[PDB]
Antibody, heavy 236, light 218 residues
């Protein structure tokens, strides 16, 4: 029943600031050191910051030191990450995590086993909150057909699709024929282009004999630009 | 920093079969208190990481004894004695001996199946796009296994660099295959400069690399 819930993520211009929160439940918060760890799109985990149970000791990764500030409120059982001077490379899902065991302030007295705060591995992680740092402006996608042809047909099966190009920010949703057609559909992960705009493709394979007897429409929804496109894909 | 070197980078497993992932640290993770600060996490697609094993060899509550962690100093292993199909995903080691906390590069575990060659399709840019001033050419590799594939673009036989991007679907839950899309992007002016657009595909399911191509305007 231990749970961590992050919030505060969003789309941010480089150089600007954002504050993340992590509200926790079902454990004595002040007894636990807490962590922030991030995960860039398609990448591994990267530790960002740590704070002792009593908030007297903090540590940062080299990549964020001087830009981020970790703090906690032991009255409200909330952990914070203030993210300043944001860079594009800060784009990531940010997760709160709890040290797997309690650990308190050092005893510089009555023993000498450690004169520093002790940190160990995390057990529970939150679902995370996404921070996307970009100079891009909101932009609706262009939806281009990937037309079926001889170059996409073999043995009575044709491939066709849509290219959902040049949009910002994520996400877009794509379906075929109002979501009724899912068999043979592959919708690929979006890629971020050098322009700073995303692009993604969705394809489907169907009988080539059906190209004249069946309508294939890709339904594209990009909520941030309020764009809804229903693109009919036909042989050229 | 303590650097974590995790191997292998990818592992295809047969269900019911054992599996081993290794982690080497750039220095000893043994602490003064006698514990060794090495942790194993798993992350399924779309999910947050979950702790499997703490301090080298201790299973986190709820984790079955299929998972066995071993090692000391700089050398560690996580073994799955029998592999079930639900174990697919990314596994990461982590150390907390010193700051920064550091993770291994990860191991992607997928399900092994028989080799399946990709069906390869090519798509010229639409007239609509050309009107806007850019041309995207798309190559689709459909339903293949294993994941390892090489896709290169040739334009009038000239190898393309720096103007393509690809992405790949998650392993299919029904047939265990992958699909991949590669997009070559050029300005309209550049697209109009050349004639033949070709996608060259190398995959172990294919006896020789396959090339799909078209002539611009046809």
């Amino acid at each position: 029943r231990v749970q961590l819930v992050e919030s505060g993520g969003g789309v941010v211009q480089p150089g600007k600031s954002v504050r993340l929160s992590c509200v926790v439940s079902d454990f004595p918060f002040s007894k636990y050191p807490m962590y922030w760890v991030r995960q860039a799109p398609g990448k591994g985990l990267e530790w960002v910051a740590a704070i002792s149970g009593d908030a007297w000791h903090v540590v940062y990764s080299n990549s964020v030191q001087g830009r981020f500030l970790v703090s906690r409120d032991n009255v409200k059982n909330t952990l914070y990450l203030e993210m300043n001077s944001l860079k594009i490379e800060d784009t990531a899902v940010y997760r709160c995590a709890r040290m797997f065991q309690e650990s308190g302030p050092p005893r510089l007295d009555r023993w000498s086993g450690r004169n520093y705060y002790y940190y160990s591995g995390m057990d529970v992680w939150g679902q995370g909150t996404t921070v996307t740092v970009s100079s891009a402006s909101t932009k609706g996608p262009s939806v281009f057909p990937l037309a079926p042809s001889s170059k996409s047909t073999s043995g009575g099966t044709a491939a066709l699709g849509c290219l959902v190009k040049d949009y910002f920010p994520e996400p877009v949703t794509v379906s075929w024929n109002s979501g009724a057609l899912t068999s043979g559909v592959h919708t690929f992960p979006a890629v971020l282009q050098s322009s700073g705009l995303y692009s993604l493709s969705s394809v489907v394979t169907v009988p080539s004999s059906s190209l004249g007897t069946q309508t294939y429409i890709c339904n594209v929804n990009h909520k941030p630009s309020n764009t809804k496109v229903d693109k009919r894909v036909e042989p050229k | 920093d303590i650097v974590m070197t995790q191997t292998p980078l990818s592992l295809s497993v047969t269900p019911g079969q054992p599996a081993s992932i290794s982690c080497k640290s750039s220095e000893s993770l043994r602490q003064s208190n006698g514990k060794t600060s090495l942790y194993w996490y798993r992350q399924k697609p779309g999910q947050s990481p979950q702790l499997l094993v703490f301090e080298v060899s201790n299973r986190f509550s709820g984790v079955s004894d299929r998972f066995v962690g071993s090692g000391s100093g700089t050398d560690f292993t996580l073994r799955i004695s029998r592999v079930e199909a639900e174990d697919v995903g990314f596994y990461y080691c982590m150390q907390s001996k010193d700051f920064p906390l550091t993770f291994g590069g990860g191991t992607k575990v997928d399900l092994k199946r028989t080799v399946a060659a990709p069906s390869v399709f090519i798509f010229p840019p639409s007239d609509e796009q050309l009107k806007s001033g850019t041309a995207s050419v798309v190559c689709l590799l459909n339903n293949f296994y294993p994941r390892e594939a090489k896709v290169q673009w040739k334009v009038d036989n000239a190898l393309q660099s720096g103007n393509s991007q690809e992405s790949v679907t998650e392993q299919d839950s029904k047939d265990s295959t992958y699909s991949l899309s590669s997009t070559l992007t050029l300005s309209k002016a550049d697209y109009e400069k050349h004639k033949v657009y070709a996608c060259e595909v190398t995959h172990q399911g294919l006896s020789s690399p396959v090339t799909k191509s078209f002539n611009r305007g046809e």
